Design a protein around this nucleic acid. Structure first.
Lengths: 115, 32, 155, 65
RNA sequence: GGGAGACUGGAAUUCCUGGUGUAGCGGUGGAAUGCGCAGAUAUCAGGAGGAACACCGGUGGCGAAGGCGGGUCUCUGGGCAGUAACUGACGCUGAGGAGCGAAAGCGUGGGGAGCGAACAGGAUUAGAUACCCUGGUAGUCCACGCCGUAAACGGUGGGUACUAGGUGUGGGUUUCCUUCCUUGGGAUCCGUGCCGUAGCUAACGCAUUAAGUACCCCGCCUGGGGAGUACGGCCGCAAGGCUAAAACUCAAAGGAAUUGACGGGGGCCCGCACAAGCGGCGGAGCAUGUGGAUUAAUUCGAUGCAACGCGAAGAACCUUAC
């Protein structure tokens, strides 16, 4: 396949960081996660692991012939900016960056607070 | 004031309530 | 260093060449507390560079310094259990000190068995960019523009 | 501290149809902006909030673009 | 956002169906149970269902208290201000009594996405019937009825009159600058905060929204435990609620503030404390000292920093105490 313009979805949580490269219509062509590059336990919550995962996903999407990327970034920031810079460094182009984080309007009940 | 007094009151109430739960069926048999 | 900045020592000019660079070099290469051996070593290296390269020792030494002088360095600062390698610009004094330190440090890993021609050979290499300390200089620059991801802290 | 534009004699009446006036008091994300920023009084801020919600339901304004 | 009824809107969590898509996902101080490789997580499109209503949104409004905010419509209660046309003391409080009364809980019938007592594993620990993690039933939600308790708190019953002010804010009438826009300023009534006199208090503190100065009516108090417990009685389906003692026992139990000490409480300032540098120890052999083990003894003391080239600035006999 050959998609010249795609999209990058970076989901950064407090316990991991996952990057998915999709077609502009929502079909994943290459994904990489912070534990897929050889990290275990807490070590996959660090910015370095986000860097490695972003680089690996960028390379696997690049070999499919991807040139430019729109970035939708999401989650409580732990390795967001590192992933952005790793996408830029690996030969890709970042067109737009948008934060799409799900925000309830006070529905559902959060779990009880840890102590 | 202090919370020692509330502590004494709650200890006594807790013991009484536990006793009142421990002998439910015997009390039901006797009273009725 | 908690109260304020420390005073700076004066630098004695050289009587043979008239530049503080050679006296700074002999101070850096000094070891075990023997000056005389140190200036004889550095002067022998200077004379071997003289006879080899065909140009003046001062100009080639300054050119080697420029080829080894860095502009950015890396400082490690910890927060929340994570250490970040922030890039920081370098004062000229620290740049010169690092250049001389790198030259003398990579002066001691050679196999060519005596100090004077070791120093002369690396001076020639650094003039031409063939040295080992220069490799670490472009390495430091590579991490300077490589580790730009951590700069908003500004510490 | 600013004055309430509606309290002045030349302040327009508030309606959920007139969506330009409502776009004046909603942020770039579509939310209603605080009464400190606008400076209008309590009653007119309440009117503005109700009008914005009404216009949101009839799909004249987006639900937080 | 005072109350009741009906209709209805969007974001988000979950599940189901179908694409792309791979081997990890989840969780933590760190992990393991757990979920996937039979196609998980992730990203698109469609559908079902329940609960709560981001921004406006605050020591801001309303209600007797409990309490009340997505929108619209229908029905309905209270308050304030101005005019002062009307009645003409019709006022205040209120023993018993009655009504309303968070959450949990109980009965019948629905509903059940998220959360989550009890219950299962995992981890921590000497042990963890806990805190942390993964699942998870009643319950939370609706209709109609029970219960009648909360740190139901302003720990401050209701009504009335008088006693320096300063400064925010919510609702309404008026005069002077008048531009006639503006918190322009002033005056007056009704709320709601902060600061401060006189006065009051054991002190902290209250202070025109009194804990000040006075009058009327109600409820309650008389050392700490035993005890809001027992017996009797009333109410309730039950849990239990309300009224409510005695023998015995102690010589105190308490309230506020003061000086130290302590904290697995904060904030500043120093020091080769870190950082910036130079040289080392931990690897080898040897000299001492110590722990441990042997024998006749391997004399005795020192034992985190602050013992371990220490008493010892001199063990062949002596030293030497074995």
């Amino acid at each position: 396949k050959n998609v010249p313009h795609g999209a990058a979805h970076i989901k950064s949580t407090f316990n991991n960081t996952i990057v998915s490269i999709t077609d502009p219509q929502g079909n994943v062509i290459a994904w990489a996660s912070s534990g897929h590059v050889g990290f275990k336990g807490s070590r996959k919550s660090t910015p370095f692991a986000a860097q490695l995962a972003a680089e690996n996903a960028a390379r696997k999407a690049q070999e499919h012939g991807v040139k430019k990327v729109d970035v939708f970034v999401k989650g409580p920031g732990s390795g967001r900016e590192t992933a952005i810079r790793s996408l830029q460094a690996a030969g890709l182009e970042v067109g737009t960056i948008s934060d799409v984080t799900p925000q309830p309007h006070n529905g559902c009940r959060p779990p009880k607070r840890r102590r | 004031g202090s919370v020692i007094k509330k502590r004494r009151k709650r200890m006594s109430k807790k013991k009484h309530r536990k006793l009142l739960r421990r002998t439910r069926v015997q009390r039901r048999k006797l009273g009725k | 260093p908690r109260k304020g900045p420390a005073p700076k020592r004066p630098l004695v000019n050289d009587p043979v060449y008239g530049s503080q660079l050679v006296t700074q070099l002999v101070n850096k290469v000094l070891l075990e507390g023997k000056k005389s051996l140190a200036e004889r070593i550095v002067y022998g290296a200077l004379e071997q560079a003289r006879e080899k390269t065909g140009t003046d020792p001062v100009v080639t030494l300054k050119r080697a310094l420029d080829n080894v002088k860095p502009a950015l360095e890396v400082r490690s600062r910890r927060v929340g259990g994570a250490t970040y390698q922030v890039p920081v610009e370098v004062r000229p004094d620290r740049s010169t000190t690092l250049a001389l330190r790198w030259l003398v440090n990579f002066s001691r890993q050679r196999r060519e068995k005596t100090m004077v021609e070791r120093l002369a050979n690396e001076i020639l290499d650094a003039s031409n960019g063939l040295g080992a300390s220069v490799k670490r200089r472009e390495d430091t620059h590579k991490m300077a523009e490589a580790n730009r991801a951590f700069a908003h802290y500004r510490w | 501290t600013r004055k309430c534009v509606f309290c002045s004699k030349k302040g327009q009446t508030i309606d959920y149809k007139d969506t330009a006036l409502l776009r004046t008091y909603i942020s770039e994300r579509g939310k209603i902006r605080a009464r400190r920023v606008t400076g209008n009084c309590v009653q007119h801020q309440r009117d503005i909030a109700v009008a914005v919600k009404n216009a949101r339901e009839v799909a004249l304004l987006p639900f937080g673009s």
